[PDB]
Amino acid sequence: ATAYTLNLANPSASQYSSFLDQIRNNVRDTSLIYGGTDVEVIGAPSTTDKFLRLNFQGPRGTVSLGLRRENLYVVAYLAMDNANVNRAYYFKNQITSAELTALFPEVVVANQKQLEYGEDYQAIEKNAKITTGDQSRKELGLGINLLITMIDGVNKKVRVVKDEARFLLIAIQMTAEAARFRYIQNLVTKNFPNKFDSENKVIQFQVSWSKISTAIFGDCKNGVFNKDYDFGFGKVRQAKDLQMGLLKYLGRPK
Ligand SMILES: Nc1ncnc2c1ncn2[C@@H]1O[C@@H]2COP(=O)(O)O[C@H]2[C@H]1O
């Protein structure tokens, strides 16, 4: 229903930052305070407003993403094909036809396509066919210019699974992950709008979102962890050193 648009025709570091803040502010419950920190926390699951729409507006067309508000999971995307026909692709265990119709009304039922693979990184990475290094998403890099190039592979083109997969990997990281982790957002704006190399720390943050959220939720007092934590990139005692942008909903503080 609610849609936020990122203007990639005229990219601005401030516009990108405000875009991420709109996402954070949309899903957060301001009454929730985890571990005495000021970091925003995703509110309890809504039965009425379940999805959020993100538009990537370019000079030659617009590609859209559909995200689940309860956990920021990307569940679908909208892109015009080679015949300029709007088509929606979705992950099966994530959304229904009726919900997809409401999310992307410009797409007719017949043009809704269920994706052959899973929504998890491993499954998408397999189809991305990355041939160098560890063959994971880290090998693609990050950045505004990279996102623009990836959109070019799906905007008004015949669907190719390899290009679709690579687009999804970058789109998920530049939106959902950047919203959750300010470290990722800061790398994007520091190198704006260039493509740059990703890091092990970027991946380490991503795989430990739940762990970090649980640690702040139940083992942190006034921003200080009760014990030392190491999520892969070193020992952390102060929650602020994590530069968190959005915490996972784990209930209300006890
Ligand atoms: N489709 C997706 N959309 C958004 N975020 C994802 C998606 N698939 C995986 N992730 C993230 O990858 C993370 C891996 O570890 P977590 O269980 O802590 O939390 C997971 C999610 O936050």
UniProtKB/Swiss-Prot annotation:
Check the record and name the Pfam families matching this protein.
RIP
Q: What's its catalytic activity?
A: Endohydrolysis of the N-glycosidic bond at one specific adenosine on the 28S rRNA
Q: Which UniProt keywords are present, listed alphabetically?
A: Allergen, Antiviral protein, Glycoprotein, Hydrolase, Plant defense, Protein synthesis inhibitor, Signal, Toxin
**Keyword Glycoprotein in record:** yes
Which PROSITE patterns is this protein grouped with? SHIGA_RICIN
* Keyword set includes Glycoprotein: yes
Q: Which residues form the active site?
A: E177
- Quote one Gene Ontology molecular function term: rRNA N-glycosylase activity
Q: What is its EC number?
A: 3.2.2.22
Q: Name one GO biological process term.
A: defense response
Tissue specificity here reads: Expressed in leaves (at protein level).
Similarity comment: family membership: Belongs to the ribosome-inactivating protein family. Type 1 RIP subfamily.
Its UniProt miscellaneous note says: Possesses high antiviral potency, but relatively high toxicity to normal cells in culture and to intact animals. Capable of inhibiting HIV-1 infection and replication. Allergy may occur upon exposure to this protein, which needs to be taken into account when considering it for therapeutic purposes.
Function, as annotated, reads: Single-chain ribosome-inactivating protein.
Subunit structure, briefly? Answer: Monomer.
Can you say what this protein is called? Ribosome-inactivating protein dianthin-30
